[PDB]
Design brief:
heterodimer, A: mainly beta, Immunoglobulin-like, 2 domains, 7-stranded mixed beta sheet, 5% helix, B: mainly beta, 6-stranded mixed beta sheet, 5-stranded antiparallel beta sheet
Chain lengths: 244, 202
């Protein structure tokens, strides 16, 4: 399998006034690299496009948003003097030719700008085992995973059954719910379900794990709070099947 | 002149199997291409169609899009919709020295539940959590799940899971709280739920 567009890093948490530099590598053979900012409020907005090491086109961002392209077509963008409203998904797209050929997007770098690193919390994660009544009525068994109390929304939740990653029988909420909807610093919650047959749940050898990867602070961020530094980490919960 | 890209509807919810129409318009007809994309939650964009300024239409699979450059319009037709079409659909145009995206159509294609069996179950507490958790499941896709009256009762929206090797799909919503005056019997009282919903004894 050949690589698609790659972007590095995937997640960043910064405070106001800091700067970030983001990288993107195009698909092999693509020479046009474009950057876009996606926010909930302004949608996708064009930053700039590079080809053969020079900027070809630019949007309407102020000069604290900058870019560049190296001779192997890799591109960087930089944002200085970060503001809360700079929190966004920073998307790169490569193309053979943006005038007549499709844009191929990366998955983005997620940036959150916060007032204070003391706003950052990892998720608490718990699994809730199936109802007996569900099992008797349907011959199916639904496990629920909750990931709660996290900020920012930099989480990836996945289910593993006997060590293998499952997608059949799963549904994870597309967006989290704000625990306190009116506040800009509100912590988040996310739910997910995994449904199996009653027979599979009833085998005590079957092992179920809900995994949440949280992308948090850097080792270079200072931390002076009593609570554990909210670094990048996995928080997990598990269950085993049960005959009765 | 200033380019403005408009998309309607902003949101579309339809039963699976139905054909869909996604509208895009642009005020400045001097474009080099128009492109349609989908975006899934937590992902970047995938290119679906690119229509050159000299072209009137493009097709791929169940997707067909027209371009009427002088009218400032494109329409995306999605035949025979599937659950896996659910996504945000974005229209973009390339102008001489700028690029512009519409605000999107958020499409939800709902599964047809062949044997609804609406119920509200209580999940077991976790020994490592303080929450009480309730599951409303197995209802028809016409059921709408509302938020709670209460600010410390959390309710998610319906989510469809597919048990592939059983040919079985189901909707569910989760409710939870750590308040003590909270019961699964009451958890979904602010939703209009089916009158035959099964409420097992606790």
């Amino acid at each position: 399998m050949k690589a698609g567009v790659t972007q590095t890093p995937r997640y960043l948490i910064k405070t106001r006034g800091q700067q970030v530099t983001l990288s993107c590598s195009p698909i092999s053979g693509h020479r046009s690299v474009s950057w876009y900012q996606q926010t909930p409020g302004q949608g996708l907005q064009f930053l700039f496009e590079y080809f053969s090491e020079t900027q070809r086109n630019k949007g309407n961002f102020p000069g604290r948003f900058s870019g560049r392209q190296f001779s192997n077509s890799r591109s960087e963008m930089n944002v200085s003097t970060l503001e809360l409203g700079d929190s966004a998904l920073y998307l790169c797209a490569s193309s053979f030719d943006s005038g007549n050929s499709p844009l191929h997007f990366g998955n983005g770098t997620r940036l959150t700008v916060t007032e204070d690193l003391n706003k950052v919390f990892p998720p608490e994660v718990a699994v809730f085992e199936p109802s007996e009544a569900e099992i008797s009525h349907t011959q199916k068994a639904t496990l629920v995973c909750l990931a709660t109390g996290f900020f920012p929304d930099h989480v990836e939740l996945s289910w593993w059954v006997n060590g293998k990653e499952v997608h059949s029988g799963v549904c994870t909420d597309p967006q989290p719910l704000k625990e306190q909807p009116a506040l800009n610093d509100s912590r988040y919650s996310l739910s997910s379900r995994l449904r199996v047959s009653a027979t599979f749940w009833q085998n005590p050898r079957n092992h179920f794990r809900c995994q949440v990867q949280f992308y948090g602070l850097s080792e270079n961020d200072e931390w002076t709070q009593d609570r554990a530094k909210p670094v990048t980490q996995i928080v997990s919960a598990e269950a085993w099947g049960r005959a009765d | 002149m200033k380019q403005e890209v408009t998309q309607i509807p902003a949101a579309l919810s339809v039963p699976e199997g139905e054909n869909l129409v996604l509208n895009c318009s642009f005020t400045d007809s001097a474009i080099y291409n128009l492109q349609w994309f989908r975006q899934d939650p937590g992902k970047g964009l995938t290119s679906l169609l690119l229509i050159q300024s000299s072209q009137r239409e493009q097709t791929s699979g169940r997707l067909n899009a027209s371009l009427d450059k002088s009218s400032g319009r494109s329409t995306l037709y999605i035949a025979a919709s599937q659950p896996g079409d659910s996504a945000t659909y974005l229209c973009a145009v390339t102008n001489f020295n700028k690029f512009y995206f519409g605000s999107g159509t958020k499409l939800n294609v709902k599964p047809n539940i062949q044997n609804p069996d609406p119920a509200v179950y209580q999940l077991r507490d976790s020994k490592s959590s303080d929450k009480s958790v309730c599951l409303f499941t197995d209802f028809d896709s016409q059921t709408n799940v509302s938020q709670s009256k209460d600010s410390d009762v959390y309710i998610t929206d319906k989510c469809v899971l597919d048990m592939r090797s059983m040919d079985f799909k189901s909707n569910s919503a989760v409710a939870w709280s750590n308040k003590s005056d909270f019961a699964c019997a009451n958890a979904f009282n602010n939703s209009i739920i089916p009158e035959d919903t099964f409420f097992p004894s606790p």
